[PDB]
Design an enzyme around this catalytic site. Structure first.
Site, PDB file in Angstrom:
ATOM      1  N   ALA A   9       0.822  -1.216   0.000  1.00  0.00           N
ATOM      2  CA  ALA A   9       0.000   0.000   0.000  1.00  0.00           C
ATOM      3  C   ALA A   9       0.848   1.254   0.000  1.00  0.00           C
ATOM      4  O   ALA A   9       0.373   2.367   0.226  1.00  0.00           O
ATOM      5  CB  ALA A   9      -0.951  -0.064   1.184  1.00  0.00           C
ATOM      6  N   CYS A  10       2.162   1.157  -0.256  1.00  0.00           N
ATOM      7  CA  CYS A  10       2.996   2.379  -0.203  1.00  0.00           C
ATOM      8  C   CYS A  10       3.724   2.522  -1.529  1.00  0.00           C
ATOM      9  O   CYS A  10       4.410   1.568  -1.915  1.00  0.00           O
ATOM     10  CB  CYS A  10       3.978   2.255   0.964  1.00  0.00           C
ATOM     11  SG  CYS A  10       5.485   3.228   0.907  1.00  0.00           S
ATOM     12  N   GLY A  11       3.579   3.611  -2.260  1.00  0.00           N
ATOM     13  CA  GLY A  11       4.192   3.782  -3.565  1.00  0.00           C
ATOM     14  C   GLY A  11       5.693   3.567  -3.566  1.00  0.00           C
ATOM     15  O   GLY A  11       6.239   2.934  -4.485  1.00  0.00           O
TER      16      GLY A  11
END
Ligand SMILES: [Cs+]
Ligand SMILES: [Cs+]
Ligand SMILES: [Cs+]
Ligand SMILES: [Cs+]
Length: 138
Positions: A9-11
């Site tokens: 969920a983290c770019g």
């Protein structure tokens, strides 16, 4: 032999994972939020990354805020134990390869420790060019 402590969920973590793949190996993927390292493993990672325990803390996550961790009132071991009890405090992604360990923030830090060169141009998911076709860092 590559391991990434990944948060899908983290770019930055996604970008790092794809750069790893673009060097031609599929890493071992640890979802640290549900499978955090042990205390011993975590101490080792920190030592190998060359950063302070506090630089590994994710700010702007609920345990950081509610535990008051922004304040300089905590020893490094206290902070390591908070990380183990609340794995969302471990900033991400951490990547281990035969060449070393890095907190890959920004994601292109990972180019330091990948043994093989990117196999073609690499552009981040938001369009930011990282390496061109020739293999030059932009
Ligand atoms: Cs573990
Ligand atoms: Cs390298
Ligand atoms: Cs290339
Ligand atoms: Cs971004």
């Amino acid at each position: 032999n590559i391991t990434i402590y990944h948060n899908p969920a983290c770019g930055t973590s996604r970008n790092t994972l794809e750069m790893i793949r673009n060097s031609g190996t599929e890493p071992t993927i640890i979802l640290y939020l549900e499978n955090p390292p042990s205390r011993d493993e975590l101490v080792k990672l920190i030592a190998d990354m060359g950063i302070s325990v506090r630089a590994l803390l994710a700010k702007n996550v609920e345990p950081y805020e509610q535990l008051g961790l922004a304040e300089d009132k905590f020893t490094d071991d206290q902070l390591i134990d908070f990380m183990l009890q609340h794995p969302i405090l471990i900033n991400r992604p951490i990547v281990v390869t035969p060449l070393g360990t890095r907190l890959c923030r920004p994601s292109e830090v990972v180019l330091d420790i990948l043994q093989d060169a990117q196999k073609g141009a690499f552009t981040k998911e938001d369009g930011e060019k990282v390496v061109d076709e020739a293999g030059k860092r932009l």
